[PDB]
């Protein structure tokens, strides 16, 4: 019969999968807001089109979620230690990967509103990094989901 | 105008909430005559108002999704009926009391014939709302509905690219690729929808311990790499179609990218000798074109799984936002309830405003910009023009 | 008594949320409908002998509902009072 | 006071209409019924002697059950009946009660302010849009009722219930009715609805004359 | 409690259809119809599909629905 | 219509000096034309009529002074939403007086 | 089995979700604190509105504490091993989440307390942006909430 | 007969891949991003070719999600301990791989780009620092792909 701590990785890919992502969407929405805020003081009207980073670092936290919600649903007493396994890599695999996706969106948003304070014509290409920077989050959700639902 | 709320409300979907943003939205246009003239710095209240118009039509698709999704603030509405019966797992069935009183969460299946009524005729049944397995089924419904919105969505912003092309007359750019475009996108990802869309209305319940696994299949059947044990083929021929669907797909990345550059080194080069045309620049542009359509494809493909991501979220946000705020004020013994629900609904409607409505609803916004500014407009709106400022008596302000 | 205009404003609003949403939560009680049913406070005790002993209860959150949505339309009534004022 | 006018065409076809439909109401809304039979099972013993069940106008028979026997060990089944017929006939006293009223209204209108009913034609014109929505209404309901009774006939029908238990598909069992439902007073309920959707698009012409339509 | 999956498809194909096809030559003769048939077909391809995607998604499913005891003894009662 | 965008075209006007004021006035009025900047080579003080945008400026100067101090009391400004389009003649000097 | 250690995963769970979310807390209670006593030297009059960061943080040790009393009723001295590790599992995943959120609502109300002292047009901007570092804390808070009650 | 702990290798060989492949992109992303932004206060004109660094570090994170699901598809329960392997060489082969490719074209781009805005000269150069610099990540995926079909 399959083993009685099995349950226990699959457990730690739900809450890993929730808490890496919510360390990517913190740091980066504590970046972006740190730059939002030293953009204010000069361009005002740029704040409400200068949240969009903040709106993208959540994203991460969402994608984390959507794991951590899946793998928790999945979860059962009898789990094989195999399921187990998949389901940690898949937390991890989404996790980590949108904390680097936050560390991305975090340092881009702040570098970026800051310039498009002084040169509006970087938003355009702020956003383009931004999406560059979630798509990292992107795939480790689809490799999150490959693992989990296989 | 109407894909940007569509969309927002496949994110946003929740009838009550609908109920809630149709309401401010009336209010806003109803009001617009007062609001117009009061004129002041509130950037909020002041851009809202300015995009009213969207809020209105958001409002209003969110209701519509919400009844699809079955939804009211986290609970559904049941008014057709369920099709999920329980008295046959009895009658039919071989439960009893003490299959019940033995089992805690215990279990459902339609295998026996008077379990399942059919679907529910106006979205999704209500049973799932009290059903603990209930996102095991919505969440593949949901990237499953993700799937297909994003690759119509993509196929209609690839078929739109052909009106531009026959106008401006660029003759290279129909035959290479749009028609490449196109026959790449139905060919890899609209496959994908046909398969989505046979599973559905092909494989049953009385197939259930063998049916296969969509991603699976459609990742293999890239690798061309059919296995012959443990999950079955989905449909006769597949091998045969699938091998010739990738194989046109291969083909068509040396279609889209040679031959333009050949062509026009043709017939800006070859001829005119027997501005000035550049063929290592011209390779490297249509290369990169090539490159980034199908790379844009898979990412782009992947992307609209934001859908079902946000749903998710918003789902699971006003289920716990009900289930431990108003919740409390429901579940107490004692007839001071009343007053107790009164309080704790204060705070239900304060958080809801903060949370769903403003943050995820902002959220549902900024994605479908995102959405429709790349992984829609890609396909055919290039958008490098001036905005007309005419003189034109702006000075009333 | 006296207070700021937006802030009558906002209390009419909720007041109008609330009993609306509250009437409705009350009805539906009343009607003994199944989807809310993780919310009324029976015991395990009270599965028994048959539908009435929790048809019961969900009356009782039903009145419990109704109470509140009367709560909020007296405040409704006094934020209409109070804008009047403003 | 213009109390001659309830003697007239139309205050008399109003005076109907507001008899019919409550005596509608009286015949369908009032309406609790019983079910009963009887059963020797293949061990005397087991008999279930005497069945007893009830039901409500409404008609949401599927959450009505009684005990059946099972004939094994005495043990019992818990039978419940078949199908709900709200539709027909909730819909059908729903209508009655909504003409019910209306006429009550056209009756305090005509005896007391019928010139403001005949200025420029308004009231006959609003009663002409009653009338021409009420023939809609009794119409469609009186349809969907008739069907309704007929069904709750069926499900209701002891030997139909009889036929639906088992307890006839195994050997040594025998089955019977010992009550079938009152039907009187349903078959008024639905007479009453043709009579009054006759009425109603009757009293078309009725009106007529009196918007200058005629 | 049978849904026959041949009423609901008739009943709302026709309805979106009509809206989407019928309806565009019903806005009448004027600047704003452009935008107004875009918005008809549209909104007719969008809640048509949304719709149908979620009717078909139960469409013979594979598995059934799980349920607390409690919720099990209720809805037995409740529910056809 | 929103379809796509509205066929557009240049044009060049040769108007005499006295003329150009009214029709810049009646183009203004009209609202569908952008004008461009033939003479960007030569800065924007630098050219005929800104000592005409000078005084004008002066007036705007004058009239949101006299508007800051009408903030200051309690009389409303009116709010009639009058548009005339300002003739050619010298109004200017009767409305600096 | 059930082995007789099987309750220190589920009261590592309980410590966790209340003291990863207290010290998220006391992060966003800090940095907020040192930023409106930066601010109130000059602009006095905006302390009560800049004091909200310091009530998103406490939110966040709410979220901690509700978690954490959830897992402490839940716990029991026959508690299965499996249900150990979900109560370990939602500790974390509301205990780290809420730090994750803490330190957001910490930089971001320092910086945007900062910043509207200089410019009150930021303070609405400030409300978003911490209105999405707390959502962190609530994803937290729901998949908590799924894995002790699964 | 194969362990019960065989596909723990394989489940981190895919997470690996797919982690640190992300991590190199967001660093690849992240740096080129502050380039840009920085770039682009004087030079606006330049965004649409200076993004060109952070395609070449979103094909790191396209490297690492193919070879992640190449893993993930191979996942079984019996997975012999030999495959499990190979499957977790693959995975370290290109995660770190792509690792050091990013970070080579995150520190390239953001110095190229830099200097094409003083030195319109430096873009083909970038463009060849670029490529040597990413294809690393090309080998590391040669490798992991022998290693992980093997």
Not at chain 2, 175 to 181: A, D, L, N, Q
Request: aromatic letters at 14%; charged letters at 15%; hydrophobic letters at 50%.
């Amino acid at each position: 019969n399959n083993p009685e701590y099995s349950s226990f990785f699959g457990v730690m890919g739900a809450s890993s999968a929730m808490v890496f992502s919510a360390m990517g969407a913190a740091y980066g929405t504590a970046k972006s807001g740190t730059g939002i805020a030293a953009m204010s003081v000069m361009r005002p009207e740029l704040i409400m089109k200068s949240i969009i980073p903040v709106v993208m670092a959540g994203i991460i936290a969402i994608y984390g979620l959507v794991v951590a919600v899946l793998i928790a649903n999945s979860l059962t007493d009898g789990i094989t230690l195999y399921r187990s396994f998949l389901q940690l890599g898949a937390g991890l695999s989404v996790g980590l990967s949108g904390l680097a996706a936050g560390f991305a969106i975090g340092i881009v948003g702040d570098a970026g509103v800051r310039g498009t304070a002084q040169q509006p014509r970087l938003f355009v290409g702020m956003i383009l990094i931004l999406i560059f920077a979630e798509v990292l989050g992107l795939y480790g959700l689809i490799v999150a989901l490959i693992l989990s639902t296989k | 105008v109407i894909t940007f709320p569509f969309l927002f409300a496949v994110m946003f979907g929740d009838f009550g909430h609908g109920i809630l943003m149709t309401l401010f939205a009336v209010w806003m246009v109803l009001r617009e005559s007062r609001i117009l003239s009061q004129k002041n710095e509130n950037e909020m209240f002041s851009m809202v108002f300015s995009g009213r118009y969207i809020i209105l039509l958001m409002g209003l698709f969110s209701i519509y999704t919400g009844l699809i999704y079955n939804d009211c603030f986290s609970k559904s509405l049941n008014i057709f009926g369920s099709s999920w019966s329980v008295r046959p797992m009895f009658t039919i069935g071989n439960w009893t009391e003490e299959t019940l009183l033995g089992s805690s969460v215990l279990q459902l299946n339609p295998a026996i014939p008077g379990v399942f009524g059919g679907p529910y005729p106006f979205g999704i049944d209500p049973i799932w709302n009290i059903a603990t397995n209930k996102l095991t089924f919505l969440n593949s419904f949901k990237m499953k509905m993700s799937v297909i919105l994003g690759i119509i969505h993509m196929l209609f912003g690839v078929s739109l690219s052909l009106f531009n092309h026959i106008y401006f007359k660029k003759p290279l750019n129909i035959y290479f690729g749009f028609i490449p475009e196109i026959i790449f996108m139905s060919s890899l990802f609209g496959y994908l929808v046909i398969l989505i869309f046979y599973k559905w209305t092909a494989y049953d319940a009385h197939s259930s311990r063998n049916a296969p696994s969509l991603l699976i299949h459609f990742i293999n059947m890239f690798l061309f790499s059919y296995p012959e044990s443990g999950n079955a083929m989905l449909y006769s021929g597949q091998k045969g179609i699938q091998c010739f669907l990738i194989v046109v797909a291969m083909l068509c990345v040396p279609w889209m990218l040679l031959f333009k550059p050949l062509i026009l080194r043709h017939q800006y080069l070859r001829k005119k000798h027997l501005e000035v045309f550049d063929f290592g620049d011209t390779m490297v542009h249509q290369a990169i074109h090539t490159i980034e359509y199908c790379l844009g494809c898979i990412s782009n493909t992947a992307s609209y799984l934001r859908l079902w991501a946000l749903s998710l979220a918003h789902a699971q946000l006003s289920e716990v936002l009900w289930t431990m705020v108003i919740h409390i004020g429901l579940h107490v013994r004692s007839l001071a309830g009343g007053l107790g629900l009164f309080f704790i609904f204060a705070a239900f409607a304060t958080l809801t405003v903060a949370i769903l409505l403003i943050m995820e609803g902002l959220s549902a916004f900024l994605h479908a910009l995102r959405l429709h500014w790349v992984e829609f407009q890609n396909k055919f709106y290039t958008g490098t023009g001036f905005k007309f400022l005419p003189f034109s008596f702006e000075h009333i302000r | 008594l006296c207070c700021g205009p937006k802030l009558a404003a906002c209390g009419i609003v909720l007041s109008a949320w609330g009993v609306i949403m509250l009437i409705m939560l009350g009805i539906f009680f009343n009607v003994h409908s199944a989807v809310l049913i993780e919310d009324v406070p029976f015991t395990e005790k009270d599965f028994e002998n048959g539908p009435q002993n929790i048809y019961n209860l969900y009356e009782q959150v039903s009145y419990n509902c109704f109470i509140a949505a009367g709560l909020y339309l007296l405040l409704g009534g006094f934020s209409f009072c109070q804008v009047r004022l403003n | 006071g213009q109390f001659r006018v309830v003697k007239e065409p139309l205050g008399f076809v109003k005076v109907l209409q507001w008899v019919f439909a409550i005596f509608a109401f009286a015949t369908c809304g009032s309406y609790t019924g019983e079910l009963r039979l009887s059963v020797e099972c293949a061990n005397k013993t087991e008999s279930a002697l005497n069945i007893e069940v009830e039901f409500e106008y409404p008609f949401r028979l599927h959450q009505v059950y009684f005990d059946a026997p099972s004939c094994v060990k005495g043990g019992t089944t818990k039978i419940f009946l078949v199908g709900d017929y709200s539709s027909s006939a909730e819909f059908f006293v729903t209508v009655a009660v909504f003409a019910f009223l209306y006429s009550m209204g056209a009756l305090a209108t005509y005896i007391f302010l019928q010139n403001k009913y005949r200025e420029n034609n308004k009231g006959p014109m609003m009663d002409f849009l009653a009338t021409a929505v009420f023939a809609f209404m009794w119409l469609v309901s009186s349809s969907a009722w008739a069907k309704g009774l007929s069904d709750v006939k069926m499900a209701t029908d002891p030997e139909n219930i009889i036929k639906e238990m088992p307890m006839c598909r195994q050997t040594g069992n025998t089955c019977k009715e010992l009550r079938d439902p009152v039907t009187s007073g349903l078959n008024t309920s639905v007479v009453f609805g043709f009579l009054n959707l006759v009425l109603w698009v009757g009293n078309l012409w009725f009106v007529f004359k009196e918007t200058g339509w005629a | 409690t049978a849904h026959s999956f041949a009423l609901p498809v008739i009943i709302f194909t026709t309805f979106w259809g009509l809206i989407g096809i019928a309806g565009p030559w019903f806005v009448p003769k004027g600047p704003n119809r452009g935008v107004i048939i875009t918005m008809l077909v549209a909104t007719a391809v969008c809640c048509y599909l949304f719709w149908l995607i979620a009717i078909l998604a139960q469409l013979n499913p594979l598995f059934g629905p799980q349920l607390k005891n409690e919720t099990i003894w209720y809805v037995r009662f409740l529910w056809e | 219509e929103l379809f796509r965008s509205e066929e557009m075209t240049l044009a060049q006007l040769f108007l005499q000096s006295e003329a150009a004021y009214c029709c810049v006035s009646e183009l203004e009025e009209l609202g569908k034309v952008q004008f461009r900047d033939l003479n960007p080579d030569v800065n924007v003080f630098q050219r005929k009529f800104v000592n005409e945008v000078r005084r004008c400026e002066e007036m705007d100067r004058k009239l949101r002074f006299v508007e800051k101090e009408i903030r200051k009391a309690n009389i409303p400004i009116m709010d009639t939403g009058e548009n005339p389009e300002v003739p050619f003649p010298r109004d200017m000097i009767d409305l600096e007086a």
